[model samples]
Target chain A: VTASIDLQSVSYTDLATQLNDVSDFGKMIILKDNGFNRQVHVSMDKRTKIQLDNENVRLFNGRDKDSTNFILGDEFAVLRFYRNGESISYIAYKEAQMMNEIAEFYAAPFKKTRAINEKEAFECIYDSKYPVSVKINVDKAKKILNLPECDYINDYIKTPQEPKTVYVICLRENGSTVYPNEVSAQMQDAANSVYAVHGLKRYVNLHFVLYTTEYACPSGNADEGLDGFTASLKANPKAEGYDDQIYFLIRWGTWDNNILGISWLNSYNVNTASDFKASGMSTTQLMYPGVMAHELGHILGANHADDPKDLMYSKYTGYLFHLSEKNMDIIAKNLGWEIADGD
Target chain B: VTASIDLQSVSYTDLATQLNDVSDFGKMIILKDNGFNRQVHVSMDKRTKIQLDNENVRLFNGRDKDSTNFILGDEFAVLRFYRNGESISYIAYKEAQMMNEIAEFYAAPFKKTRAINEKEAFECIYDKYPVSVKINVDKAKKILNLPECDYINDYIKTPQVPHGITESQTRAVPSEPKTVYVICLRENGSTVYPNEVSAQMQDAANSVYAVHGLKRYVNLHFVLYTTEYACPSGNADEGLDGFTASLKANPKAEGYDDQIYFLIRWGTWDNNILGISWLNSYNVNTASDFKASGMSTTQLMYPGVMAHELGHILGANHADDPKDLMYSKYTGYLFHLSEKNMDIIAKNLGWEIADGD
Candidate 1:
């Protein structure tokens, strides 16, 4: 949202794109001044953080916790002061309150992950793409969330092995999940569960990209689910990626199978946008670790396992939270997290 | 790979399956009195480290990493006992060893810097064309419609984990203009010279490939070849059986590249449904181009008709918008694949989602 910046600024911004590290998750957007080289790092993660008076704030991607915000150039330094002050001293030591990241912030330890008497494992679809969005119908969902603006999404939490995610659009029927204090908690926890699967504690931090219409969130749900909801799909003109990103249609609807959530799942091809296209619909399950985590696992290239207790086996299974060997292979392939042969 | 677990001890190992987490991302498996009781929690993430028996310490999935090592079972508790006993009361976060996760990742940097010059962007033909093909005299004699399909210097492209993937792990993938190539069908049966082989048909195929390439970041390079084989059937309604038979009869049809064939015919166009595809088909009736499913000469030179059908071969589908090349009918304005449809095409390419596509 800030003004002019030539390639000179762009080059500098691109340089820091690699600054996204798991440890940077909760880092604050420290600003000496309000963006004119002034104050505030505007991470609207908290419901109280609003961009209402963006008037005085130079709207560039800078002055935030994540420097990737500088993708299109920003108003401040695209810097991440390193959570522990950029020191090898941080390698295996400990101290600072603000500098310390929660070594583990995600959990879904309920028993009976799959339906207890599930006869066989359900076929699960895998393969998902990024910018995969979640659409919420506030009334139908029955809960509200502090949706993050796409730009406000901090890079400290972005990862090379994780899907670049977006909250896309949120209309609340009232919304997660695990019924955490805030709806964001459900999302963040579910997100972290998946992120942790590959070795990073936490990654995705969706910021609500503000479009004039978001304030008045178009009021209508064709309820056709993913394939038939062009009305809601078209509303995504705020798209930072021209809608090429994977679109996950999130709604509070009944699933077609014996689960609370569903994904088209296929062997993943991060590059391909096929069906096993990563779109899903869910109701109360959006918050529980089991449903979203299970459904999301499907989006990440997981299918079912022989054990009903495996993460990809069944949706509502209280005991189904672990990924099988087959599940991990695809996940590793999709994210390119497995070290190369020589590496 | 640690295998063969004594099932009697499997139950104790099963408790930790639900123990996977960043909190447990580094939680080491600690052994007690050979499966006796008195334990706390089991974790695998960093933030907490417990040095148990270095014996039988097996690093899997990668170095200094996390789980599945406990699968098929053993005995241990997944626990996270804070780094150096750090607490919430600490002002600075100075500690924690063995931390992290990258389970989800990708997509972005829309479009690319291809030939920036411009053409009128013609609305972009059909056939049992084989795996290889060339422009035929029929079209050469009359020039052609939608000329943009002929050359694809800018079309040939490749994709990569646009953001970052393999090339490294625990390491990073540098972003580059990583690019891919995207082409044809051939003819082995009789011809429906009702519309002779022409450059328009060839170019239309090129245009269809071009849009998908441009839309999905996969590049396209048209390989137009001139070949023989009658398209079979002038009429009498083979009802598609004859068409399926022709595809199988190519002698090399199953293995033959269609770009080597010729423009086939209309889909049961309703006379105008000019484009369709069956690139990864199994039903013999689902041959790339069949005569009876539905033909029309009006669509002969329609832009994208050839590319449209060819797109089907590559697994792309119709766009909700009638203007894109994958639309049900030629828009004469079709030039791009809807993003989602574009994704399916790259996906069908196989293996790596990025470069594999």
Candidate 2:
């Protein structure tokens, strides 16, 4: 169930072939390619325990940049490990097909165990729960991230039922130019607007949380678009159930990617004052609450209304459009809620 | 192949049981437990042949609603039938397991089947060509910051290949735009100027939307292109098709119900072809990117090819008729979306045609 192996000495291909040999369902092959010339053992069991005596890895993909001098090379290798079925290896220059084969084997999806019965109550991927979170780009919305004002939050019953102990959790951040609580309200107003249209938060006590300790980009670093920002917040925590915890993220100002205010992440990074002055109310402060609601609807699984004044007016929008019976049913079905007759 | 079946008389569960019974592998029992008493005979030999005799269905789900008027009730029943493994019948409420079992019985997902070289080549789910139009892997991840997971949606009964046919194509569209984030775990060999590259992707795709009469269809939010990563993904030298390997490495995450992917690589695939949309990513050394004017290296060379691939993305199978857009080889003929191509666009792709349109 264990072995000591050098990562570099052996081809990654051969490693795969060697590793796939341990097919005890849940066994792991721990590879220690310590640069200092050493050996290591890995487990071929579901729960492989590791007590590191001396283990290390080397730096280098062992190839030179073909053209540019010192071209930026490998960012970081996400050293993934283990396999169950068959072992794989390298075929000289090319990796043995087992390398890619074994990987695809592990990524298959989980199938449902039984039929969907009425009394059995069908559920969505989230098991009927929505995740709402807050990430502060350096605590611009302090009071909201403060945790103190959030305790007295009441139950927000959506319909059908409830979970009393499903309490609050925060995803926080820190910003130098501190803004007030009204900005936080913009996020709330947007959520409220969507609920009015489709009623997603019908049941629930608010379990709100703030993101903290973020090494925010320097002032005016309009954050290189939204992907990097999103990837940064995607784990343990910043964005766990959001895909089904199903909610919003609100962030204020930053460097302009040529356009102001983007909800491509359903989180705003706006500084539109220079762009808008419908009145002094452009607020040099925050993004439009309605705009947040418009994009948030996409997450709620609602499409744009065929209406002219609708919140879903493309390019994008404001104002609002009532949800059509057809649209209401669509959102309901997506959330696992059965729609009522001709309502 | 025909029988007197009531829409409300038989429980769909019973039908699942009967269908399970008939053919060890062929019976397809499709019933809604219709009453509101009927016995229907479905087929079993691999294919289920159903004849309505003269069928008309009510657009109503069984029970009446609660008094708040906003009460809950099963709204409607979409009667579905047929199966294989012989034929099948009615079972009671206790058969949720059989219900789920029977479903699973038929929906066995296939592992990578393309390589099949016992001691030579091995493969996985993404190794085979998926019936998709694009594989926008790494691009989606960088922009959305989504981690390495099977960003591909359309994961219900399929890990590779859905139970697509006329039957599955009827799957309903969400009335409102349902947004799902996407990232191609693959890369486009195009190291070309961003502006030129971005414009063609937009302009070519734009015409497809307009011709199809779309008014905000499936709002697939693209991350544009991701920069937050290392070494594009997969190894050309290793023949791993990095992008495909990225997907096989990362399982498709939950929540999103469908997918749209894109893969552009070196002219190593079939005929230096322009671009193809397959989760397989490996298309018989037909094509690749770069070296444009040479006509040898296929490319963003033009989008009649790009448009052709998207046509495949919309519905089932494809057309080899060089005269058609769905035709595989590019002729640069300003072909229109064939009736077959447009046939299921609204149903499967979620593109909404305007009233007059």
Candidate 3:
């Protein structure tokens, strides 16, 4: 009768069922119905990482350390078990970390990141119009930075592309005087050098303009004051092709001396707000080609890269003028250009 | 100095500057610096609606009930005015509603909406594996109340996963799992990812059913339309109309009526308006209004809004209470269902009624 007994009525453990031993790399758990007629078996290695990827639970089986050996499923739920009059539940990865369960082993791998704040050398603030922002922390940058060389442009590109016009406005303020042509030329040179150094010149043509103006900034919160100043300027009159031009502002005031530059993402505008202190650079120099070049890169849709040596790096590295492949790809996409193996 | 020597030196009211009567529609005020050298003149008509459009404050001049005369600016801020020793400030549109100021008029206009729930009749539940939730009930009891209707209790048992079927089954399987399908629409090369839609749908379902004592579950399946549905009007309801005709043209898949269907689109005239659906319907149109960035992630596809719409499909009416799940507007992620609404759902699903509390 013992051999012929139904599993639903008898203790299945007494049947001496042959089961493989648990792997040394992971633990296994089995869930059985009270009647022992149905069961669920689950196993996971300690190194496994689980990601709540959009709509799916993606499991990275780390025991083998193989990226290819992963599982993806949308059918996941909290599976509960009753052992010795106590109940325990195993939830999906989304709730795993908070529960201190197996899901902890399935949590996404940690990445190093920091918040942007006033402690940084430069920061770009935004209102409702611009939802994007960037910050440059000089303390995090490399000691020695790369300088822009026109020859570097040819390394990434060899063909000519559509031209984008840039309007350089040297704002005169704080009883200060600015030579429009001199500042514009310096800014234009920096812009060109950076575009070339980052391999962007091969696909972009930059037309620089010396904007003549009768504009003055109001005295108040320097950051908020710029909003009013920018509005008044945009409302002011400009030339016929103004609709297609990108505006860049170079500040001549000492109000925000720490800020090197700021920009409105995808808005075709950049503001070099100060003659901030940077290594290998003179504070007396009102215009830094590196700063203008960085802001221009932001306008071209390049974001801050983690590497401080890259032109799109988050920090204002005095003379760093190189762009990462990531920045080049983003810029290429924004410009509707494709990056090939050599061109 | 004499009283009239320097106007800035004396209270301006002493000069008796003649001013026009304030309009009956609204009040007027002025801002001045401590020294009175700087001032800002401001007035608002009761009907004026201020919208915080991207990078601009669009003041709809409604003093004369006109839309043509409006002011757009990026210089808007919380303008504080000191008068009679009280500090009063008027914030721009974004912060107006919270301050209980005149922003109530500026609040986006409301449209009537109802929540989808299990009351009217057909309801869809989900699980890791789709199992039949349809219960055998007395047909006569569906229309009339009687003691004989109690047989529904027999069918109310927790659905069991079939025996001999192991969870170890990986990859391909022959059996079909009942699924809720999300069909995304593309217009002019703009479309949302189907995975995002499913994630949101699942999250909303999870939150909504977690409250039910029976612990209902649902499975989501995603599909993208082969044809593009142009939405020039930018209305989600209109976009749904465009897709529905094409959707019906194709043959119904397995368990089409039994499974839930959601049509997703890319834009809406207003970003706050997330979705629209009909009463007692399994079909819904959910829009991804990109104007509000990060909404999908932050709101989890707007779980409350999705749950509200689903409640409407299940036969729930809009609750007057803002805290109720079926409220017409999305104040926050509301999960509570009113007793009457809960009872209606229980009765419709042929389950024994219990107090929602």
Candidate 4:
């Protein structure tokens, strides 16, 4: 059932010739070229265990119990052991749809698996419910793997015919220039202001969190060298199900006066400096007003600048000389609410 | 009306900028570049005369003429002057169409002047009357001035109604190992054979010419190459005409084979090589017999192999394949008989072949 192969002289042409020789029989060619000298064994049976004394020869055990009855199909299970690291097991299924689903779930919060129940998991793993075990150092394993969390809010909202309350969690950076509390308060105020103007105060709740950087000065500008300061927002553990929290990084003096404020949401970079400067306001006054208008615009799913007068403009070019009815209509359409009733 | 300005540089950008500055009022600049240590004069004149002195400085003498008033059209006339083995003058005139007409008349057979009868000269040039000019060569004067030929051929043909004869030419190289002359003629039009005949003929012509012209025109065979298509016979004399003709003659034994004997006329019209062995004795007579039979289909032209055989009789393969006549096409088409063919025959007949009455 088992046969040996020389890896040094093997190439695609040689492999093609060899495949023709064993076309009738089901065979597995365990290729062990790890960018160095290694032993390769071609076998037909799965039950046959390969014993290796050389540190470089890492074994890859398949799932079949019988060593000689190797079944080849569109999908193949692989267990690879790296000499320098740990052994990881994976099912090499050739379904593009399943791959796309897994990729989307990995990109979701906590990088969790998207299978809803046991039935869904069984369908994805092809009825192989046994947890595939991989050996690694506990510390390294913890960094690589995280326990999947359930979506409680999504589950609860499934029953309601009425619209569910959605919160927008805006993370505020506090420091030497703009205080964290001020940013958080401004975010809440801006959310309320936008809601009132559009009259959608019923369906949405806005929350803000202030996180101060312990290692650096509180200058509100984009710091390119600082790691983790200017990145996509991390999902909040407490507001996991109910709110969508967007993280914003601001540092003072690091950014030019031309760039007064910026918001990172939905993979877009938005700035509000030009509008604030044109309003005849100081940097302090402009920062809060610009951040509020810009971040709230992000919540409403408005894209980056196309029009200079629009608040969602990537570069703040200031509002129109006079507020036009068209501008009000755009704001109303995005917020999903009418103008506030005269109180 | 003359204005002088110092030249700073002679680069394209600098020249364009300087030209723009002096474009108004049609001014001229007499410049001396300090960096290059060269003197240059620029003038906005219709025709400026350049006098080269000591092969160092180029002097210009003209200022009053309008720079933009020069001729601008498709048909232009140029006076090419060759003296003392060197080109002394090349002048383009403002009246392009008229100049072209004059040039055409000069290219005709007889020494006809345009002024004597403009209509006659125009007709002669327009219809392309073949000209054979004999210029008196003064060897001494040519060596001193290094002037080039005085009258160069410059004939342009205008589009006309289609005539009976349309010539096409192509170049070829026979597959290696086989004596190039023994190349199989495609009788049933195959994809590769249309251009194949021409390519093989070109190789044979070049090989023969290289050996024969080795003495008189030492590098002539090497210098010559094949063209793909020949011009129309009427337009053969035109510089851009692509037609040519193949002379019929018996194949030289040992040196050649009678390719016309294996004439496969199937794909000749489409310019493709015919299938091999398509013209066996059962289907058609022997290769030569099939060619003689008038019953052959007019839709298919004679195979390219026939034309190639005729090229061998024209004293082409012995030295080099004269590009014009020796070029091949699976479809029977001729560009025009080459001047080389005429020259060789003339050389054989003491430059004057008597036409028997």
Q: What do the candidate models score in CA lDDT, each in turn?
A: 0.29, 0.28, 0.33, 0.27
Q: Give the C-alpha lDDT of model 3.
A: 0.33
Q: Which has the better TM-score: candidate 2, or candidate 3?
A: 2
lDDT of 2 by residue, B51-151 (tens): 01101011111111100000000111122212221111111112334334432321222122222331111111111221101112122222233222211
- Sorted by TM-score (best first), the order is 2, 3, 1, 4
> What docking grade does candidate 2 earn?
incorrect
- Clash count for candidate 3 is 16
Ranking by lDDT: 3, 1, 2, 4
Query: What is candidate 3's lDDT per residue for A1-343, written digit by digit as tens?
Result: 1112122221211111101112222222232333432222333221211211111121222222111111222222222223332222222221223223322222211112223333222222222222122222223211112222111110111112222323333343334444322233234334544454435444444433333345444652334444444554556665332434455444542234344455444343223221110101011122232555665566555667677666656655444354577666655555445655234
Identify the runs in model 3 with alpha carbons over 4 angstroms from their true place: A1-343, B1-199, B217-227, B232-237, B251-257, B269-273, B283-303, B344-357
B161-249 per-residue lDDT for model 4 (tens digits) = 57796542321221211111222222233222211233223222333233322112211110111222322322213212221111123
Query: Which has the higher lDDT value, candidate number 3 or candidate number 4?
Result: 3
lDDT of 2 at A97: 47
DockQ, per model, reads: 0.01, 0.01, 0.02, 0.00
lDDT of 2 at B302: 37
Worst 10 residues of 1 chain B by lDDT: B98-107
Query: Model 1: runs farther than 4 Å from truth?
Result: A1-182, A200-224, A234-236, A240-248, A251-259, A267-276, A285-288, A339-343, B1-357
The runs of at least 3 residues in candidate 2 whose Cα sits more than 4 Å from the true structure, single-residue gaps closed, are A1-343, B1-174, B178-182, B185-193, B203-208, B211-217, B224-245, B252-257, B265-270, B279-300, B316-335, B344-347, B350-357
The C-alpha TM-scores of every prediction are: 0.24, 0.26, 0.25, 0.19
Candidate 4 CAPRI level: incorrect
- Top candidate on lDDT is 3
Clashes of 1: 151
